[PDB]
Amino acid sequence: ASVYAWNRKRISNCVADYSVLYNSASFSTFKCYGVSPTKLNDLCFTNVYA
Amino acid sequence: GNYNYLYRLFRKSNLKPFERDISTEIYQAGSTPCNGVKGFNCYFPLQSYG
Numbered sequence: 385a386s387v388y389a390w391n392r393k394r395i396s397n398c399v400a401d402y403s404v405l406y407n408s409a410s411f412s413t414f415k416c417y418g419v420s421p422t423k424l425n426d427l428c429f430t431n432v433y434a
Numbered sequence: 435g436n437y438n439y440l441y442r443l444f445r446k447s448n449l450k451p452f453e454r455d456i457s458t459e460i461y462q463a464g465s466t467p468c469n470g471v472k473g474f475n476c477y478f479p480l481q482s483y484g
């Protein structure tokens with residue numbers, strides 16, 4: 385989608401494998417501002433907005 | 435900007451009490467090994483306060 389109409393996907397009621405997303409080398413920027421990248425597979429959240 | 439004061443942004447493990455780490459070795463922040471060379475998910479541990 386475009387940036388003025390960014391698509392919002394609600395991630396809930398599922399188990400999320402952030403290790404596959406973090407270990408992918410295609411991403412040129414992986415910067416977190418409230419959590420740690422190595423603790424995404426350990427922490428639990430109510431829902432994720434993408 | 436006074437950049438002479440630096441803190442350890444990246445380390446593998448937490449320190450002991452009264453433990454000092456001055457080792458300027460590279461950190462591996464991803465699955466890919468760094469081999470002492472900066473790159474993708476390879477960052478210097480010491481970053482300066484701005």
